[PDB]
Amino acid sequence: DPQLEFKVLQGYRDLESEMHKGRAQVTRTGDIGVAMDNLNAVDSLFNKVIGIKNNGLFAHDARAMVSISELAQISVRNLKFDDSRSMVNLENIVNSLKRYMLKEHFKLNNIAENRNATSSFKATSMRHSYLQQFSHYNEFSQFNWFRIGALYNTISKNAPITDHLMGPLSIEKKPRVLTQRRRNNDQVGEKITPEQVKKCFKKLSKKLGPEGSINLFKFIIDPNSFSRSIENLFYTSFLIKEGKLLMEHDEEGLPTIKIKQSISHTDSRSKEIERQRRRAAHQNHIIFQMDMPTWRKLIKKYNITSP
Amino acid sequence: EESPSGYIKKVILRNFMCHEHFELELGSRLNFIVGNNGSGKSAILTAITIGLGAKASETNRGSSLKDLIREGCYSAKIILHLDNSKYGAYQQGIFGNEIIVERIIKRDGPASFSLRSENGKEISNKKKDIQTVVDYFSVPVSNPMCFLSQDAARSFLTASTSQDKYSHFMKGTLLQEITENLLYASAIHDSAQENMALHLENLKSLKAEYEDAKKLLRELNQTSDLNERKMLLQAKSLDTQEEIKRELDKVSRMIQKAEKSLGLSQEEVIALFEKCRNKYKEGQKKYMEIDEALNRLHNSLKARDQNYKNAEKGTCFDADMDFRASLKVRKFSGNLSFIKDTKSLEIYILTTNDEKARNVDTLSGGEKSFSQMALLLATWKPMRSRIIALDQFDVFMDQVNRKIGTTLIVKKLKDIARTQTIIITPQDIGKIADIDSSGVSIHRM
Amino acid sequence: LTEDLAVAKIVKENPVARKMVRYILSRGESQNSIITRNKLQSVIHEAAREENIAKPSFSKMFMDINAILYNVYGFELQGLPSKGHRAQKFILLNNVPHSKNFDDFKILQSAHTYEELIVTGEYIGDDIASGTSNTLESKLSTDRDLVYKGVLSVILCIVFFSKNNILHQELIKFLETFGIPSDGSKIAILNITIEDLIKSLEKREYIVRLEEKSDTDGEVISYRIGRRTQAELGLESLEKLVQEIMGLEKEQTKSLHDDIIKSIGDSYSI
Amino acid sequence: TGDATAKYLLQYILSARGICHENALILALMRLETDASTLNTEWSIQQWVDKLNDYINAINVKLNLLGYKIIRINHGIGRNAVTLKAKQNFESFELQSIVLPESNRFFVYVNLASTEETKLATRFNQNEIEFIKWAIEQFMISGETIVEGPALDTSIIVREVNRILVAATGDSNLAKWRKFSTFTVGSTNLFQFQELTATDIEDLLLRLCELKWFYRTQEGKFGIDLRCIAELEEYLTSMYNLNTCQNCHKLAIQGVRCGNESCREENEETGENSLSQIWHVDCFKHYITHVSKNCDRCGSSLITEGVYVI
Amino acid sequence: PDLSSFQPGSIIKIRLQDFVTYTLTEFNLSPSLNMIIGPNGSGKSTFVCAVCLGLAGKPEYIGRSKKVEDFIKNGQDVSKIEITLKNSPNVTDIEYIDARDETIKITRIITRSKRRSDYLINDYQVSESVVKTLVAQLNIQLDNLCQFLSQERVEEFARLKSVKLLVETIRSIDASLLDVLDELRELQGNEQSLQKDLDFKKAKIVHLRQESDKLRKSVESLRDFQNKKGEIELHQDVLDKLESEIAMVNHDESAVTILDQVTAELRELEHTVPQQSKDLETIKAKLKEDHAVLEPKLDDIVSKISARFARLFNNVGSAGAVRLEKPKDYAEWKIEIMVKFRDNAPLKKLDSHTQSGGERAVSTVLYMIALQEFTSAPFRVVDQINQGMDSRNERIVHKAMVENACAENTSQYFLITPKLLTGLHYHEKMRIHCVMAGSWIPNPSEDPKMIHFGETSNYSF
DNA sequence: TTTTTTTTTTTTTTTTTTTTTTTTTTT
DNA sequence: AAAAAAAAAAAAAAAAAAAAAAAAAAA
Ligand SMILES: Nc1ncnc2c1ncn2[C@@H]1O[C@H](COP(=O)(O)OP(=O)(O)OP(=O)(O)O)[C@@H](O)[C@H]1O
């Protein structure tokens, strides 16, 4: 059923189109329900096809599935369980950064400050009681940012290398403005019987007879040309490759090409294996060499067919 | 007849290979481009291969774009008129009714890749667009089974690695994106399950806080009857009491240690209890909702995997059976062994005088070129490209197998009717066979 | 005494490492310390051709480079995990066992300049007609590149404590409580905007921003730790930083490991 | 600790952009001998500066094998001046009331040869180092020119020269030397570059002053400082035809001269401006206290007929 | 034994035993031209695999298979390859054979589990290396892609990088002195850079002399300290002298690691230069000696090749010729067959990425057909040259082989062709082969009576 | 004069040829 | 078990596209 595939592909395209708004929405808020509002629709569009299992729709489905798992990932990262004891929560460490970056400020402006496996049970009125009074400064110049710039340089693993002037002062200048008209304005584009194997067979079983016999002494020869006298040989090779001419040499010397006429029986249950094993009775081939000078020696046997 | 549009209408050539400026239109579903090879045959197919977002390294007719330029010029451009005018088309409201994509290559700087609309309005000049419009039309141009390469046929048949044919066939019929995306989504699910098992410990911490806060409520308002619930008969207030004051110091130390835990008062103890309780009873809801969502996702993924297994087996057997049914025209046959362990596409073919299973490199010519066609025509129903191109399928085989190639490919282009075709063979089949059934056209350079 | 004659022989039999230490020690002076392998090879292919020696296997001169950089002064070249001598990108980083317990000197003598460089709430550095005396007090670094760790320990300590996720607007409205303006006025010590500071901070790969697209609503972006802040830092030393910021001594800090880990989880990842 | 100590001290010195006073390294050594707990009681400052010199010799062996070097130069404004400027900023944060000999040696970290490897070790663009070279040629050209007038009593060169003159002679009844020549161009002329703009030169001079080589005098004029020794060590000056010291034959662009008619007359036989004999402040102090009172080139007397250089 | 016109090294008649479709069949060749022909997969293009395996050749030189015993007709046990080749008057130093016999027969009998079996030279037991050197001494090589190309390597010609084209087109005669000349060039190239490094060691010596100046300064500083130590006796002139020596001595002298810093590191740099330069000069002299003799004959050969090639190439429709290049210092001497197929396009190179199947096939034929006189090779095996060739580019590629094989002084052209065009132009000394098939053939596996009967060359036997 | 578009340059990342090296059939 | 070309493996080389910066022109 093609129509079902067409329409469910359209539905897949629509869901993939709205997927970007879905992803932005889950990125902002942190709500999982958008991962399921489309999961229901993709499960629907998946099961809606039951008669042909056409690839490509499964491919769109795979893209939709990795996208839904991605939205689930974005949502699952956005859970936050805050404790009252854990002394690393955000508004208890930003209000300690804003503690350390001003100890010299409190000593400079002389505005002094007073005191206001443990299993992590409870500690709130020592690390949120008086470490929160430092929360109303909002001007840059008050904090010594030269003390949490130099607590990342001797605590982290920064690479402290200096600037040397013996080298870069002796570089070369660059008056190498590129060539005008390297190559511009080309814009020149000027707005301006080959196979014929059955012919021999339709001559054979119309003129010779269904069990007649001729030879090289009669068939491949030609009294005027050599082309038409070797093309016949290649046509004979095609015919005997097709298994339609009987070529077993009698001891007189001449070859014998007779129309292999299997008495008409279309039953093949043993004729097929008979032919296959008769070819397995391997036809060690008769290399039927013909030259140019001896084309005139074997005309028939003594230079006479129809010169 | 209905033709889902996406069939390339016109190739417009500006300084390419050996053609300054010639443009010839394509046909309905099968076209014949003949003449003399190189003289306007593989150039057209190289234009169609490149101007659909492919490099020239994997074309074997020029290892650099800047080498493909007509010698005597500076910039080459090729205009490809797709057809966006029927079912399944791509944004008919913006791109008009006939997309026009072109690529401009010059002997220096970056090559130019542009989407142009119908009338001429330039849309987006990016290489990520042409790789999206045709991905929408689903035309795989890179791998040989869709766009065969005249110089790569003779080597693809035999010289390709055992894994080459397998991976090309697999990623060609879309059957590998499914495995990759499903395994990738499973990995995402594993990472999410690990984050959930991590969140389980934080939820345990919240649970411990909720229960110990309940314990604080109990140990706080356990001293209610001792000093407050006696308000019954003291209404006259608000001698012989021999045993009044007994444990005033013990109750004092108890109240001190109870209210001096961290510094909260009685109402503040109950307030923290309520806050931690609400935190726990909301985190529970969020955690369980996430768990249900993940479990439903996982079960849907399992129902994807089983259908994937079924689809793989079905597609492989379809390939096998159509391959054999095409081989049986020359009275020999074989079987394709998709060994999913060593990742192969070994083509075991036999002749009219054999016994045991022969090799894929043993037979040649007749048992080769006619295995090329037989393997390719078992990768045209699974892969559903809207267009297909053939360039000298008969790389070396005589006249009695070219007919049993042509009169088989014409037939296999009747069962499917969504794919346009262009065939590149230097021979003469113009008005030689009974190809008068419409859908074909002659184009000799 | 094996070290001195050892490094002498090392620099002796290998004259391409001697002409490579004085390259990676002068690409990463204090700017971006990453070196892509493609470049490390495109320079080693020319610093060994004109060196009268066949260039050895990369995994030989790599151990040679590490041996030199460790012996003379104390550095280390190291490849970062890109999602051993196979890392696609390498960074320098100090490696001597740090001496905080007497890096008191280097924190003090670079904190003291606050009592002399900003009085009455203005910076007196751009005052040209001033008596500059730094070369006689040995001021321990620059000052347009010391409030670049000043603002990079209050952006990668407000991503190290929100579970490796913080939005853009949340970060701006969480920085404006420090005084750092955001409407477009340059921060008045290091003389640059805040958005361009974040962009150049991206180019150094200290943080990575996530780009979205919504034509109807707009774009929102998040600031999760990049790679350089994961390799040139470490939990074994982030514990030290956060142990000092709170000023609490070694007794009330035993929990800090798991306290951080259950609030930071997907940051020290790949 | 050999690895440890010789690993710490180089970090100390190239962290500070290079240059670092000796009385800071000798305190970092007491920092690190306690960080590995290798305490000492039988020592004075002599053994300490000895051990510092020994460690610098070892580190210099390794570096000279690598291709960089730790020079050991003197700042020529004198013991009392530099100890004032340094231990005047060590009164709030101070170690344990130790006594230091008022020293002047300034270890510096520079590269010897301008190879192709360290060709690009800068933050500056092309135009910016072009301005740097243009500025320094202006510095030397303004240095060669001497002019008459009253010399200020504000700079430390002037107060120190007068103090040591009075201390050596003993008789304070002496007047001012009546000329000055400055190697420190004023701002308004360097602002007059052609290609770049004014604000560019403003912030560029600020950057350079932060890179510890363009110290700015108290009057608002900058010269060139202890990353001159990384720059054409002596042909930096003989290129613009400036000679060297007398007592040590190292460089000097600030101190005492005697440019009177006798030691005057740069070599016009060849045209190279080989100017007068120049001293360092400590060099001049020793040369006047324990040698003579006379310019050695053509027998002058400089305690009355000398020049101020600033 | 009508050996009346067979040139030495040739092959006279093949007879095969237990091959892929040849259980027992015997060819009967001709001295001049034996156009092998027949229907598809008729076992007519297997006689080429047979010559490549019966002249002790390798298996990869054909491309038909990959392993050595894959030609043993599956169903058999052992395969016998009997082939006869005319004896040469220049080939000697061979065991179990004299220099009188005018016909030698090399036969290799491949077994099942033993790929590298024994050989057969005139019914005598011969090892592998002996017959390999004998077939080499018969001036017949099979790796020369200009002489022996199989069906699976016809257009592996154009994929040959130029340098290798020169090597395999001049190893038709001899040029090993070109190899020793390349060795001389690389020796000179390394010597040049060593000399430049010595010229930098010169500046090292200059720096060492400057450091010696610093050493002398350190000795004068030590002399100041010598005075300081010799005169320290505080028990007024003496006191004044002590104060005039303290500040005089620079307290920053770093001669500790400079005094004995360098004494003998430069004499080892100055212990290699002069005779090394003389050796560079004698290398240049020998290089000029070797290069002087090469160029004249090596360009005269190429001029003859160009004349014959252009006279043969003008029939396709536009001009072209072969040009040598000697641009680089002899390690990249290379040849480029340059071709034009119509006039208005320029003269272009020959490679895969330039021309089609038909053009590259025409080039591969006309390059190895005009390289006829200028090499000693009795037989050549052109393999089914029809890949992408239309009528006009097949009649000519065949006519220009017939009129080369029947003019005079003809070498054996092995030509196989499944296709066959009507109205060709045949001549006298050619021998049109063929290969029959079909189960209606009187199988001569037991009776060798009718093993060849039908050939029109032995009309009465 | 300032903003936007063009343009050139640089950087990063893939792909074709090429070398390496343990394993391995072998005398 | 003492030589051998062999298979297979790692590891650098070039190619193409993208992004940033600078120049130039229009408003
Ligand atoms: N290893 C083998 N064992 C047995 N038979 C084989 C083997 N390999 C190939 N054959 C058979 O022998 C025949 C080989 O013939 P040949 O190699 O001449 O084919 P061809 O080269 O394609 O023919 P042409 O090139 O003349 O069209 C094939 O038809 C094939 O079926």
Residue numbers in the entry:
A (entry chain G): 43 to 158, 192 to 267, 285 to 399
B (entry chain D): 75 to 312, 895 to 1101
C (entry chain F): 12 to 94, 117 to 303
D (entry chain C): 13 to 106, 121 to 336
E (entry chain E): 32 to 266, 867 to 1092
Paper quotes:
In eukaryotes, the cohesin and condensin SMC complexes organize DNA, while the Smc5/6 complex (referred to as Smc5/6) directly regulates DNA replication and repair. Each complex contains a pair of SMC subunits and a set of non-SMC subunits. By contrast, the Smc5/6 kleisin (Nse4) binds to smaller WH (winged helix)-containing KITE (kleisin interacting tandem WH elements) subunits (Nse1 and Nse3). The Smc5/6 complex plays multiple roles in DNA replication and repair.
